[PDB]
């Protein structure tokens, strides 16, 4: 049982490390957009349609995944 | 065939044990013979005359014990060697039947 | 989740206390079981009389609060001062903080319930193992008894044989003695042999009766022990099945509780996010204020969902 | 190889039974030897019953020897039979696997 | 009730992660089995982490980009659309053609990823099966030994009873000898020396039998004890093997299903790649076409576009 | 066993893919075949139909 608990923690460590890399990537991606913006490389016209298209897809798909995980813990 | 084989295999183990018994009985007879012969020999070194028959009986017990161990070994080697042939046939038939039951399904 | 625990609770309440008083080896088992059952009962009464009701209250208050919390005026509603909007937001922020604290309180209650259930299930399992061991030992004894009972019937028949052989010897002796007596005219040796057969027949009948009365009387003691052990094992297997069922009920209730803990934890986090979204909007003047206020409006939907979710739990 | 294995496996359990036989036969020989030795000894105190006592002591000695020898063989044998059986099963599995890939 | 291909693999992945390493340290015959199992389990874990942390996410990304692309380019304008130069239409088509080419290359890339995943899963399932067979062999050998033990244990109880018999017979002989000796002694105090001798002899023999039996019994149970210990040890080892074996068997099934799920995903991407190539071919032949043959290839490309949009929805479901 | 594995990988990675391509090509072909009269209006030439 203790051995199994040790494995559960080892896996949770990997899961957490993964989450750390994900946030780190998002932080870096934001910095790149900021740098792209500041230099005049993009426009607040085009970057709006970019985030709006992601919201139409990816962002909505993540928001759903969040509500789903919230239920999976509750059993609701 | 499989039933006649299991019945024969049962009949074969009896001779196999009968040989195992003769081999052990021989080992004990020899062991006892040695103890007797040794006793008879030490009694001949005080009363030479009259502890010769004890030594003879001890040597005879040893001799018979060896004879039984030898005879049993010959029988055993042959008996397992008849048993082995029967078992091989049984396994072969079992495999064949299974294969048939496989393709049959 | 709640109904599943509510059912398991009332069910445990119905768990009757046992006296294995007849079984000497189950003395510790009975007391241990009784104590554990008593403790579980305490856990249930608390859960029923306080916990579930308190949880319902907090959720209801939260439900009413979010109900009032209309659509968030990220900019400021029509014909109001900036101070008026700030005051209303500050009031809402304070209320949310209180609600957050309440949510944390409910979680703690759930945590205690979880621990109580966990302890109950564990104690149940311990009783089951203790019982399983008793019947698994007792069934070694049972085999040695059946083997001894088989060995006893042989002596019982051996006595029955001696008794019958004696009856025949006497019967034959009488016929011989009578013949030998009529042949006396001498025929004294025949009469002697007949009397001897009669005498021996009586001796065998007497000796056998003594052995038989004693042999069945050893057999009786063995059979009594066998039956007693069989009954004890059955009783253990009876209470054992019941405890096993209770252990499962608790294991499920644990999952139900853990679920409720995660639900409250989510609501607490969602409130903290709305609070953070709110706070940063009060110390923001123009566009960044409307940004945090819109995010808080999304917070508000996330909390309203968490409410409906907890209500279902 | 499989035949030499079945022949060796037969020789392994054979010695195992041969020890089991000697241990039982040994126990009886000793039991009988003790009864005989005791009889022979009481007849030597009661006038020429030395040969009976000798035969009884010999039976006892042989009985003990068989019980001891069997125990030594058994303790040594038990580890060996398992190794042979493991190899037999492994070979059987390997042959099946080979027959499987072919099919 | 049935799961999507990805969820089936996602479940199998997290499940393999939970696979604990075992030590058959007590079992000498399972030494190689344990190490082999441990190694294979370790490798499978590596396959899962990759699948979970990289593969499934990368696949999702490529599909999403494809979904967005086809969304923008929903239907091919076979005819010269309203108020445009022929060059303007050609440029737009050429741009679409170039984008499709890039998307095709991306699709081939995803397929390669799937191929690697397939191989990784296949290897995992194979190693699992190998452990199962290795285990099955151990318990199937160990159960020959178990029978020889039960047969020997049966043969041992006979000597155990034979000793018990000698001990009792001795107790009775002594008891009877004492009664006889006492009788013979009282009859010698009237004028019965042979009776006393027989009584003393019966007593002597009774003691000898009780002593000899005790020696045999103590030794016989002590041979019986060794045999029983081995039997129990083998029984436990076999059970442990049958325990881990059931688990490995379940893991093997999980991998076999994941293999089917992966193969399905490979076929899906292959279809999307082919559908893109057809649209590209339909496009290319329309740029180097006169009036009517251009509209013909452009309409076929519009049908291509629907076939790709379907392939997208299909992959999304996988 | 290694060689057999090679045979399978080819069958799976290349045969199965080529088979899949075939269906797509067929799909594209029948797509155009319908598009033939779909484009060719009322009063197209016999030569125009023959060319298509």
Residue numbers in the entry:
A (entry chain EEE): 272 to 347
B (entry chain JJJ): 167 to 271
C (entry chain FFF): 27 to 211, 216 to 343
D (entry chain CCC): 167 to 213, 216 to 271
E (entry chain DDD): 22, 24 to 213, 217 to 343
F (entry chain CCC): 63 to 114
Sentences from the paper on this structure:
Like the AhlB pore, the SmhB pore contained ten monomers of SmhB in two conformations (type 1 and type 2) which assemble into a ring with pseudo tenfold symmetry. Although the resolution of this structure was low, the electron density was clear and continuous for the protein chain, enabling a model to be built with residues truncated at Cβ. As seen in AhlB, the head domain of SmhB undergoes a large scale conformational change transforming from the soluble to pore forms, with the β-tongue substructure refolding to form extended hydrophobic helices to α3 and α4. The transformation from a soluble β-tongue containing structure to an extended helical pore structure seen in SmhB and modelled in SmhA, occurs in a similar way for A. hydrophila AhlB7.
Tripartite α-PFTs are members of the ClyA α-PFT family. We present the structures of the soluble A component (SmhA), as well as the soluble and pore conformations of the B component (SmhB).
